[PDB]
Design a protein around this ligand. Structure first.
Ligand SMILES: Cc1ncc(COP(=O)(O)O)c(C=O)c1O
Ligand SMILES: Cc1ncc(COP(=O)(O)O)c(C=O)c1O
Lengths: 319, 319
């Protein structure tokens, strides 16, 4: 049912575009210091510690066909991330939700990438008394972003297990805290391109799989799903994959996933908010179990997008 | 001869402060997109990938008593860092040097912290063709920053070996590439404060010392200097420490430094551009070999500041 999903998106894109010459927010909208402004014009202070030392957390809910998807899960993860970094969401949570909906309405964007950022503020942890630290908030709405483009999801992507880089371990930086410190992940993207592939899979350096440059990894083997427990973000897409699998009666094991399972499994897909369910059909230059998108991947694919119209996981925005 | 160095600084500081209310650049000046602006007013595009994914490198030379210290070393390290990250300094190096000198002069600042930042730009590595990527440059000059303030340097600070966090390993993020991804270092600063100390010493997760939140670590035992080789920034202050130690006939060992050596060494000091030579007299709540600043620390301290008037390591700015 990719045709239905992608055709609906192509149609809504054409409409969105024809608003660009008259709606200054049609290419994205940003919230900065309580003002709304076109995304291409948003500026932040050079001295903000979110920039000076990437001292921040963030989270990215999405809108599809005018329905916010699992927004409360994203806001709850954001607050959990903040707590773990000794940050505090600078506005009441219900007010933040209110602003996000309004921002989407003004943009007219029906399929949107939505980002919230909480930074330490203008005074850094080093030599500022904690009582004088004032956290900052930034939010923006932009057109939906594809870690895997629709036309590649019909074909499958190519991945490698990275050998020149490995994932930052939790004892250095907690990967359950969503953060913008992408040094290892960018190295991985460089390595995949050098090796003639699109996506990097990073190990934990101890012969287990973790995650990639903006996605969780799922292996399928003998009808069972396998996905890394430790060392990764606990994605909302992954959580939706788990909800779908259980509804379908497919076993899911969130556990230590040895690198070797990647070379003898039946299917592979990545999952993430900016793109959804993303099949992988070659691994280290070899077809994954024959090279075709697998049946369980397809079932999860359809179940994920179905959830976007399910009131238990979504709500409709008034534009 | 701390008295002379610090009293000279205090005097120049009183002059600078007296002008804060009439020189608009006296609190700092920034270069953004070819424009010079007061530092407190400088702003960068929200969508710059230096913010969105901390996809950048940086470097921090300094000015002392109107004399740039080792600027060409810092600029060469910046270019080497750019190369490792596949970035390119956006202006010719000699034009970059000329702008900085101009910026210091306009500010009137005689003791300056000078930062250069090269970011990926407005288009990210994920989903932009490399040929369409355009790196951005930001620079600023601000009053000299003290990781350890003069009064504390006369007496020594207190550190802990961090036990809730360890340093990001090189196979994840190269610590010789100066970067603003301080997730582990901020955790270290929190841990130190939680424990009633100031400075965190992070290990490599294999029982060896690395560096801290903005500084290298040097141990002194039986007349020999020891400082970690792998897993740390190759500090320009550390390079100056080595030049001074060789000048004095003191042996320096840049090698693997087991954590245990910190508990039985004779002296400890930190070194960094933002403060210079910073003695440590208590470790994990215990005195370091008596709790007094050691004689080899004092010799390195004096020689470090003497090098700031040596034409081989510095040049005078025309204000
Ligand atoms: C490193 C990383 N892992 C996993 C994910 C997937 O998380 P989620 O499904 O909540 O978007 C992302 C999100 O972009 C990510 O950046
Ligand atoms: C992590 C880290 N280690 C060491 C240093 C010391 O480098 P340098 O002496 O060149 O300033 C710095 C400087 O702030 C640093 O951030």
């Amino acid at each position: 049912s990719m045709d239905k999903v992608f055709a609906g998106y192509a149609a809504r894109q054409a409409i969105l575009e024809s608003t660009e010459t008259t709606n200054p927010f049609a290419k994205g909208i940003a919230w900065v210091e309580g003002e709304l402004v076109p995304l291409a014009e948003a500026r932040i202070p050079l001295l903000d510690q979110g920039f000076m030392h990437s001292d921040l957390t963030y989270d990215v809910p999405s809108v599809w066909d005018g329905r916010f998807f699992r927004l409360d899960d994203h806001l709850t993860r954001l607050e959990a991330s903040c707590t773990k970094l000794r940050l505090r969401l600078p506005l009441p949570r219900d007010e933040v939700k209110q602003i996000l909906v309004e921002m989407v309405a003004k943009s007219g964007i029906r399929d949107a990438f939505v980002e919230l950022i909480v930074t330490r503020g203008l005074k850094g942890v080093r030599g500022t008394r904690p009582e004088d630290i004032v956290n900052n908030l930034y939010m923006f709405v932009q057109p939906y972003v594809w870690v895997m483009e629709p036309d590649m999801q019909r074909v499958g992507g190519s991945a490698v297990v990275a050998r020149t880089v490995r994932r930052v371990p939790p004892g250095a930086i907690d990967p359950t805290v969503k953060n913008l410190q992408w040094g290892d992940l960018v190295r991985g993207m460089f390595e995949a391109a050098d090796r003639g592939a699109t996506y990097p899979f990073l190990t934990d350096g101890d012969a287990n799989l973790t995650e990639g440059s903006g996605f969780n990894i799922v292996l399928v083997k003998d009808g069972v799903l396998y996905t890394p427990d430790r060392g990764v973000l606990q994605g909302v897409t992954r959580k939706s994959v788990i909800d779908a699998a259980e509804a379908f009666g497919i076993e899911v094991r969130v556990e230590f996933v040895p690198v070797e399972l990647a070379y003898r499994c039946d299917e592979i897909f990545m999952c993430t908010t900016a793109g959804g369910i993303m099949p992988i059909t070659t691994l280290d230059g070899m077809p994954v179990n024959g090279g075709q998108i697998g049946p369980i991947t397809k079932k999860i694919w359809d179940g994920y997008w179905a959830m976007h119209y399910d009131a238990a996981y979504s709500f409709e925005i008034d534009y």
